From a paper:
To neutralize chemokines, ticks secrete small cysteine-rich chemokine-binding proteins in their saliva with no homologues in mammals, termed Evasins. Among this broad range of chemokines, the chemokine CC-motif ligand 5 (CCL5, also known as RANTES) is of particular interest, because it is one of the most expressed chemokines by activated platelets and plays a prominent role in the development of atherosclerosis.
To prevent higher-order CCL5-oligomerization, the E66S CCL5 mutant was used for further experiments, as it mainly forms dimers at physiological pH. Unfortunately, several trials to crystallize Evasin-4 in complex with E66S CCL5 were unsuccessful, primarily because of the precipitation of the complex in solution, even at a low concentration.
Author numbering:
A (entry chain A): 3 to 67
B (entry chain B): 3 to 66
Amino acid sequence: YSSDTTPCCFAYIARPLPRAHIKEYFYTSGKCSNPAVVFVTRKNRQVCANPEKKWVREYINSLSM
Amino acid sequence: YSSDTTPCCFAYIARPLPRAHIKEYFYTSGKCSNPAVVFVTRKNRQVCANPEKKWVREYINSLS
């Protein structure tokens, strides 16, 4: 079993980030207690977000284009 | 409560790391389900270790 660390999220950003500031996303490991999308901003900040939220799913659909 | 990510551990390294390869350590957040020490190597690898093990406690003492 991997002994590397892996990033987990413990709170979700409450309000949508500006779409234009987001360049990438990834999901946190299923081993984490919470499911999460992490948005990577153009300043290379990583922001935890709730995968069940409509705006989060909309951003994912757009980023996957 | 921050929406930053934080590193968590899900397995512990079984064999002691070479002490000469470690530059620092930190404990993972209490928000993680498992307690852990992270040893950071000089190549910036983050290696999870079991805080209950004698070698882990010895390494922590030497780094601090």
